[PDB]
Amino acid sequence: MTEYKLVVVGAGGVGKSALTIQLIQNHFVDEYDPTIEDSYRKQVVIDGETCLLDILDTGGQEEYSAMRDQYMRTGEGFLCVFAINNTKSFEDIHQYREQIKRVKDSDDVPMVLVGNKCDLAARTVESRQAQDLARSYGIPYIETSAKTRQGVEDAFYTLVREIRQH
Ligand SMILES: Nc1nc2c(ncn2[C@@H]2O[C@H](COP(=O)(O)OP(=O)(O)O)[C@@H](O)[C@H]2O)c(=O)[nH]1
Ligand SMILES: [Mg+2]
């Protein structure tokens, strides 16, 4: 069976844990210990192929847990997440991508830019701004809501399809 190693990165509070929990357990949590950093597994069929997702939900920043470094170096694809109502988290994306390019020593790394919390009103980051950023990196942009489930499967499965074109 094919395994796909995915890593979820982004500023604190954007919904990295919520997105992962939604994919894994199909439920939305209003509060998830921001310190909890762990890996989750899920068996799913994507385009007729049964595979196992090995997902690392990264926690704190400016820190390198023995596990994060491992997934960061062995990770096959990255979900770079920001929130639609958090301009700083969007501006922060540049830092996460520069970091990933450094670890892989490459500018061709499977990656998907995710704009989360699309269920919230009065967004401060327009879809167009994110689309422009994703285009500049040569990767897809997908909006999601860990609360309503909108785009969640699409974000993770598209990341798998990016790894496949690699
Ligand atoms: N309305 C809304 N709240 C969300 C969404 N995703 C996450 N949250 C909330 O945002 C806060 C931070 O989410 P969390 O998953 O802990 O963020 P992380 O720090 O990136 O892991 C929590 O209070 C969540 O309930 C979403 O899509 N919509
Ligand atoms: Mg978290």
Q: What is the CATH number of the domain that holds 8?
A: 3.40.50.300
Strands 49-57 and 77-83: unpaired
Which residues constitute the domain of residue 100? 1-166
CB of 120 sitting under 6 A from ligand 1: yes
Two structure tokens written together for 147? 């609360």
Task: Look at residue 25 and give its three-state secondary structure.
Answer: helix
Q: Phi/psi at 45 (nearest 5 deg)?
A: -105, 120
Rounded CA Rg of the chain: 15
| DSSP assignments along 63-132, one per residue | ---HHHHHHHHH-SEEEEEEETT-HHHHHHHHHHHHHHHHHHT-S---EEEEEE-TTSSS-SS-HHHHHH
State the Cα–Cα distance between residues 70 and 126, nearest whole angstrom.
34
CB of 9 sitting under 6 A from ligand 1: no
State the Cα–Cα distance between residues 110 and 148, nearest whole angstrom.
26
Distances (CA, A) of 2 to 5, 52, 53: 10, 6, 9
Domain count for the chain: 1
State the Cα–Cα distance between residues 20 and 148, nearest whole angstrom.
13
Experimental approach: X-ray
Residue 31 Cα to ligand 1 midpoint, Å, equals 8
Distances (CA, A) of 76 to 7, 90, 165: 8, 22, 12
DSSP 134: H
Task: Kindly give the interhelix angle for 152-165 and 16-25, rounded to the nearest 10 degrees.
Answer: 90
